[PDB]
């Protein structure tokens, strides 16, 4: 009945979308995982849920998801929805291969996912996908690149943007846009996460290469105990 519908696909009298900016406040409750690119490859830097021992082993974490040989994605907000959509977008990646025998240049993928997620906020009367997930990737066309999207639908090349709480302004006083030298990108990542820390309560993951094929590393345990002692002051 028309008394019962939440009426998600309605413009406000101020013109905005009520169910969309409620998803934007869902990101600020739970969300971390910045991403830094360099002249070399790109990394995510992430946070787990809490200190609660009672957690045996994650193959990959609940944060960094593999998508192709040359792409990966990280997730903010509601974790139940995005899992679905990331499997959804994973399907998209593979069928581009089936249509083209190319490793899907990542802007095609981000455009496709943002079109279907825009389609859930356009009609159907359903709630929008409450996740502002972001993407890292490489293609032969462009360089190493990361994109960042939100439950509204728009996206962009967001060279050092983080998602979730405590919002990135320090990064737009510290990132050198020309050259970055990915070891120092790790150093800047543990700087920002050191302000906002071993791999019990951090989840950092890099994307690099050797001889053409890309390598997605999840930065196993003892590397984090290296970088956490790479400070004195910061």
């Amino acid at each position: 009945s028309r008394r019962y519908d939440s009426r998600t696909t309605i413009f406000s009298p101020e013109g905005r979308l009520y169910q969309v900016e409620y998803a934007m406040e869902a990101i600020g409750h739970a969300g971390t995982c910045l991403g830094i690119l360099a002249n070399d490859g790109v990394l995510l830097a992430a946070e787990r849920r809490n200190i609660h021992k009672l957690l045996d082993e994650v193959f990959f974490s609940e944060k960094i998801y593999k998508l192709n040989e040359d792409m990966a994605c990280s997730v903010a907000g509601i974790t139940s929805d995005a899992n679905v959509l990331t499997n959804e977008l994973r399907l998209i990646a593979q069928r581009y291969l089936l249509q083209y025998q190319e490793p899907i240049p990542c802007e095609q993928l981000v455009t496709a996912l943002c079109d279907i997620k825009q389609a859930y906020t356009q009609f159907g009367g359903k709630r929008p996908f409450g996740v502002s997930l972001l993407y890292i990737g490489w293609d032969k066309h462009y360089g190493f690149q990361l994109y960042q999207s939100d439950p509204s639908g728009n996206y962009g090349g967001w060279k050092a943007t983080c998602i979730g709480n405590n919002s990135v302004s320090m990064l737009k006083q510290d990132y050198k846009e020309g050259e970055m030298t990915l070891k120092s990108a790790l150093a800047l990542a543990i700087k920002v996460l050191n302000k906002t820390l071993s791999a019990e309560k951090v989840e950092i993951a890099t994307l690099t290469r050797e001889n053409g094929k890309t390598v997605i590393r999840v930065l196993k345990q003892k590397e984090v105990e290296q970088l956490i002692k790479k400070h004195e002051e910061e």
Partner: protein
């Protein structure tokens, strides 16, 4: 029963069609040009059934043209060739078999020139030189005898004139003019048509 030919150079690939639009007993206007302009550097050719050549390959021209003028850059000829192999291969068995066999000349910038080939069953294979039609059956050994893997441009053109003068001499169909286009690292450039 038409004729398509192509030769892959070291930094180019040249194709040539027969410039004859046939009928039951007679031939129509010669030109009708079979080589369909793709984005900037891809160029495919189509013979076979009279009515699926102008239909299928133009639809492929629509989708690849939409890809370039939708997302900036164009396709490499590998993805265009596997694209049209997918589209013909899944339009094959369903309801209306598109009975066309394609050549697809092309080159990417940061890899070599490629000349893809497929039958009417959409089985794709690279080739340094490929042919089509009934005229394929006699002219292909001249591209076996003389084709080095590295060949200059004018040597390949006069080799192509050897192939067309043999095709003029033995093959029973009146194919008097042939449309020739060399594509290479400055874009689709077409040489003057060969006549007799």
């Amino acid at each position: 029963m038409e004729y398509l030919i192509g030769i892959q150079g070291p930094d180019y690939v040249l194709v040539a069609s027969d410039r004859v639009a046939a009928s039951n007993i007679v031939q129509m206007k010669d030109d009708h040009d079979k080589m369909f302009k793709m984005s900037e550097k891809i160029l495919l050719l189509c013979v076979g059934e009279a009515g699926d050549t102008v239909q299928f390959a133009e639809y492929i021209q629509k989708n690849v043209q939409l890809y370039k003028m939708r997302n900036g850059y164009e396709l490499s000829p590998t993805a265009a060739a596997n694209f049209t192999r997918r589209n013909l291969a899944d339009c094959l068995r369903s309801r209306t078999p598109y009975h066309v066999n394609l050549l697809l000349a092309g080159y990417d910038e940061h890899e070599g020139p490629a000349l893809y080939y497929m039958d009417y069953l959409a089985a794709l294979a690279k080739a340094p030189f490929a042919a089509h039609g009934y005229g394929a059956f006699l002219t292909l050994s001249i591209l076996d005898r003389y084709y080095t893997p590295t060949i200059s441009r004018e040597r390949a053109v006069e080799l192509l004139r050897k192939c067309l003068e043999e095709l003029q001499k033995r093959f029973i169909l009146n194919l008097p003019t042939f449309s020739v286009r060399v594509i290479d690292k400055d874009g689709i450039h077409n040489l003057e048509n060969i006549a007799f």
